[PDB]
Design a protein around this ligand. Structure first.
Ligand SMILES: NC(=O)c1ccc[n+]([C@@H]2O[C@H](COP(=O)([O-])OP(=O)(O)OC[C@H]3O[C@@H](n4cnc5c(N)ncnc54)[C@H](O)[C@@H]3O)[C@@H](O)[C@H]2O)c1
Ligand SMILES: NC(=O)c1ccc[n+]([C@@H]2O[C@H](COP(=O)([O-])OP(=O)(O)OC[C@H]3O[C@@H](n4cnc5c(N)ncnc54)[C@H](O)[C@@H]3O)[C@@H](O)[C@H]2O)c1
Ligand SMILES: NC(=O)c1ccc[n+]([C@@H]2O[C@H](COP(=O)([O-])OP(=O)(O)OC[C@H]3O[C@@H](n4cnc5c(N)ncnc54)[C@H](O)[C@@H]3O)[C@@H](O)[C@H]2O)c1
Ligand SMILES: NC(=O)c1ccc[n+]([C@@H]2O[C@H](COP(=O)([O-])OP(=O)(O)OC[C@H]3O[C@@H](n4cnc5c(N)ncnc54)[C@H](O)[C@@H]3O)[C@@H](O)[C@H]2O)c1
Lengths: 371, 371, 371, 371
């Protein structure tokens, strides 16, 4: 089997979907690894480091996409890449299909077989391949939120943690999962007063236990959500139902009642946004205004700390990459139920129910492709 | 007596030297309070809020400077203000005289009588008027340091706290006083591994006690400083000898051997900078490069979070402002040795020994002006 | 049924496989309990204490081995005990068969039926009978490691926790399971800077959550493993694949590049050792040298704190002892899949797959012995 | 002035009274530094390291003692060194004179001028040169106490921290000063339940605040002392009255009522011992028995971790060494009242009142030697 990794083309995307250690393991097992030259440059991995591990460097993107049986990526295919999608080829990357009909249609029309990092799910309900990017983004959201709270950046001009005698910032985190817990933890470490909302009370119990009383928890009812968002300096949206679109929890009329200069960071923007006003932005133009608040909506957040995120991602992905490479996609998916649950696309068939329900028709096929 | 507060004119300076509560106290005691129109706008204090407390609003800066016996500021007089300096007037603000020959010269030449906030010193050695601004700055340094470590900003692209399985950022703080303790505390809260250096072992003992083992402490010898700074992702300089220039502890050749994309935040920039390459910068152009590292040297740091810092500052200054207004400068200074230590300038005489020795001649007069 | 407990014969083994409370439960249910006189003396349990609970005291070891249907021990049979092994007898103890061809062969040849404490495994993957001994050994490892770091015992002469102004010891723990978590917790409590490595990222996540940032986590790749071990003063090997031999993770060539006087504690020595140079030692001669480092390799660790470890063990084992005594071995194993997983040996058949593949041939039989 | 450092001669004493950084400072100021060849070897400081800093290496001890105006040591002169004591020479070291009539007499008869590290005391009551050795010894006491609690070393066989479901060791620390606070902190970090006693309630308050409820505090009356010691597994004596002999707080009759295998560590053994049965031991024979308990009585404790303790000591002593070298002993003592408090001996006169009243006659002279 032939494994390809191309350079990420999305705006400011510095991650790469493999490191030399991973190349070494693949080649040890007799697979060939093709890598677009310069693909690891964002993450400070030279073409030479890749070579030394047994990779064949290739001059252009086109030659990675043709040739490769298993295409490993970080982000979803962008428009300019739709034409590179092949019929007898496995695509393994973050897809976020429920948020992009165009990407979904491009996968279905090309007949490619695709597996989403973010829907790979173990029996206990964890998402081990999203988890590490949720950790990075949760932590990032508190830092960038803290920074944009300065007057100098258009925020209301309060210091996260206050100083003795003077009140700290008021931070609300919607969602007590991986990203939410990490956002809350960092925000609390900077001295903010932190409140997190979720519909799952057990998630609130764990948070309550972990910090004794320090992080406040509220049940995420409409009343309770409005009360907290109204008073907040910084709101972080970190909500998920694993493969689904993402509920609109904060309306524009709500934001109209917020303190001027408040900042809202929508981690749930890949996947759709959990604020009504959310729209994907980029690291070049990260923010925009909604009634006197400032919105921060970068899809692709982990990309700005590639030294951390590249390693965090590939430590998690490799064992699945190896299962795919050794056994081919079906069989890997028959042996590994968590990998099966990541199956999204095959020969024009939409294999994920949540995506299908949210996208209107398509219509599912379950996993009678697994025969 | 007549108390004047003008609008701050330094770049991006949003603080104001008094709040309504302070105005009300002054007025209740029979003093007149003159305030430049719009002085509190940066801090969200309206001209109307100031009136309600008993202040006379004045259309121009010039009328505040002429007329006021006691002039309250936040920052030092800047060049455009040198001509406003008067002979029979008390100026109470942050001066940082050892770092500016020009400003010292202008104070001497005008015959003004000046008290520096930053050299008001209690018997125990504390600096109660600097302390709140060192708190804000120390906490800001960690925040802005974390942000500039993103590849997106020119930094090396590591997340402060790392994520499980991946190392965190390596933070070194030079100086374990108010600013350095606070920078250390926030850096630690964001999950960084933190080392602080000082020549004062007792300061190191306190920090060791407060965080059990969590914050590492190193005795600040040349060898220990070089070792730590070489390995650092973020270096925060927080050194002071109370009225003095500030030693150059980190040489350019040392920074030549640092990791590419490291960031150095020099909180000791007012006062002169403790890195050899430091130079005062502004919120409009905060950073610049030195051999592949990024330097951050905003004099003026607390200005960006005025909602926090204006209150933190005036909570501390008000009792001293009251002593000055009720009794006049000599007598206030005869009564309160902490105030006497802040005496910098009177009728062409330099009253501060540290400033004097550092500025070359001038030559001290001690406080036989207190008669 | 008749239950026998002999005196432990291994070097410095002070534990006993049962306490008076356990004897009393067995007796209440109509079983006979035979105990070698003096078996509880290492753990401060007198012959009289055992009598009061309903035990028959027996003068010699031989009479316990013959006579007893269920033989409860703490350690594996040693060579002088091979001749005591009988055909229609249940042996329940720590076995570690993958580390001893001889002990395995002796059980096979004797036809005895044996269940290993260390492979009794519940549905969630936990090893409830190993666990309390991993807690003791993990906590012991940090203690004894701390001690042998003194120059006086051959170590490099650094204090675990340092003192303010001076760096602490650098501790690496390989394996984030029960013993690793416990070693890290105590090492950290003593002020050391602690890094733990594992291939299981979820175990890294738990450890990151429990101590906030305080215990560092590193993904266990060969590169990360080398980096960390090279810099360490104390290395603790706590790696564990349930019934298997144990990977050699630290080569002799690697130890040759370690700081002189470093100490390596191999908790995984029962089971084979995870350092290349490891070899079982005893409490009489616990350490030996390997290239200027000091190895500590006591199989048997919990034996030195029997007041703690005898109770910790028997609190966990008793419910399983009761099921075996009441129902006999098959039936107990038919009803309790956790107990079935501990089945090692019966009438010349090796019942553990991991042991079988590690020992070369033998060849498995699965549990068609359960009929 | 000429400064000499000889090799420490006490049993297992691996510390050295100076480091290369200290030699370099002395040399820079125009002083001569003479060092016995091999003096730094216990602390891994080579003869070459000392040369590079400007030191003259000397072949024998005798030549350091003759020749040197200022003689810097770590331990007190031992008997084989009494003949080396000279008239016009400053001795600066740990003395513990109230515990040795012989050493005192030898200093008196020789006419030497001696300053004790342990009685150098600042205005606030702190002992800055003792302090770093009390930190090391306090942390060591918990480590070595933990170790000797193993049955394998004669202790009762309880693990410091217990394990879930089983009780931890019960630790009592007598004295809540530097060593006591440090012993408690490490004991607690290892999971023991820790009670500390002192007659100074404010020290009890500090310790209650620092650990919230976690470290128990008891007022040290005879009733409370007996109650706590009777129930303890580990007792640490850390009591300290600055220059005095040290009260016998724990009688032999009391130890007769202790649990068998209990361990008593007498940190206050330099200075005389605070247990009736205490007697100075060495690292070669650290322990002895007293009524079924085990006593640990190493005078000299910090010597086993010289990598830590040499730096901790010399970081504190250097500024005082510099004052002595530059100005000579009187003058240094006239300028620095803290140094004056360390004055012990001059031309046959005993200058310490506490030592004098404890040793019976001698008789004080105060510091009319300072003229
Ligand atoms: N592109 C990026 O920069 C990036 C990176 C990582 C994660 N994310 C996104 O962050 C979001 C959350 O990620 P995660 O891994 O923490 O998910 P998670 O599965 O761990 O947590 C989701 C949590 O949100 C909660 N939730 C669902 N509906 C809710 C509601 N109506 N009100 C309050 N809480 C609700 C759930 O109960 C759950 O506890 C996802 O949309 C994910 O895609 C984005
Ligand atoms: N303009 C601003 O944005 C701003 C605001 C606040 C404070 N500051 C500056 O921050 C600096 C720190 O102020 P602070 O209140 O924390 O001071 P502080 O007096 O409380 O502490 C300073 C510490 O530096 C240590 N130090 C002195 N010399 C040293 C050396 N050579 N090596 C290592 N440590 C040394 C001292 O021992 C002391 O503990 C000052 O320069 C102050 O002016 C700037
Ligand atoms: N005889 C004794 O004194 C004594 C007592 C108790 C336990 N032990 C030994 O301690 C060892 C650890 O036991 P435990 O109960 O903690 O086991 P555990 O299963 O709870 O955890 C072991 C950990 O090792 C990790 N691991 C496996 N392979 C790894 C790899 N190659 N790199 C890094 N990590 C890896 C696993 O992921 C797991 O998290 C076992 O060998 C056990 O027998 C010895
Ligand atoms: N040689 C060594 O290895 C070594 C090293 C360092 C310290 N020490 C010894 O440790 C002892 C403690 O030193 P330290 O630096 O912690 O002293 P310290 O002065 O900081 O504290 C000693 C404490 O003992 C308390 N104390 C005095 N009388 C008491 C009484 N009768 N009952 C209860 N508490 C009482 C004091 O109140 C004080 O808080 C000293 O003897 C010191 O010499 C030995």
């Amino acid at each position: 089997m032939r494994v390809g990794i191309p350079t990420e083309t999305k705006n400011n995307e510095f991650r790469v979907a493999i490191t030399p250690a991973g190349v070494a393991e693949l080649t040890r097992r007799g697979h060939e690894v093709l890598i677009q030259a310069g693909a690891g440059e964002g993450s400070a991995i030279t073409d030479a480091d890749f070579k030394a591990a047994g990779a064949q460097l290739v001059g252009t993107a086109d030659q990675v996409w043709a040739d490769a049986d298993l295409l490993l990526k970080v982000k979803e295919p962008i428009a300019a890449e739709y034409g590179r999608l092949r019929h007898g080829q496995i695509l393994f990357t973050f897809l976020h299909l429920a948020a992009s009909r165009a990407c979904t249609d491009a996968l279905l029309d090309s007949g490619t077989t695709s597996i989403a990092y973010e829907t790979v799910q173990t029996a206990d309900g964890a998402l081990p391949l999203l988890a590490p990017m949720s950790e990075v983004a949760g932590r990032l959201a508190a830092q960038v939120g803290a920074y944009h709270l300065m007057r100098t950046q258009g925020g209301r001009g309060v210091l996260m943690g206050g100083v003795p005698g003077v009140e700290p910032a008021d931070v609300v985190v919607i969602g007590a999962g991986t990203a939410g817990y990490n956002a809350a933890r960092i925000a609390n470490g900077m001295g903010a007063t932190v409140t997190v909302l979720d519909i799952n009370i057990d998630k609130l119990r764990q948070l309550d236990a972990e910090f004794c009383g320090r992080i406040h928890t509220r049940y995420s009812s409409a009343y309770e959500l409005e009360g907290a968002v109204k008073r907040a300096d910084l709101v972080i949206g970190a909500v998920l139902v694993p493969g689904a679109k993402a509920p609109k929890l904060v309306s524009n009329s709500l934001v109209a009642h917020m303190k001027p200069g408040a900042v809202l960071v929508d981690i749930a923007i890949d996947q759709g946004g959990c604020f009504e006003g959310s729209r994907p932005t980029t690291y070049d133009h990260p923010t925009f205004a909604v009634h006197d608040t400032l919105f921060y909506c970068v899809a692709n957040m982990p990309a700005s700390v590639p030294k951390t995120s590249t390693y965090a991602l590939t430590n998690a992905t490799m064992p699945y990459v190896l299962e795919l490479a050794d056994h081919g996609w079906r069989a890997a998916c028959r042996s590994n139920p968590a990998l099966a649950k990541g199956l999204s696309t095959h020969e024009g068939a939409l294999l994920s129910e949540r995506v299908a329900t949210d996208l209107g028709v398509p219509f599912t096929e379950p996993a009678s492709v697994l025969a």
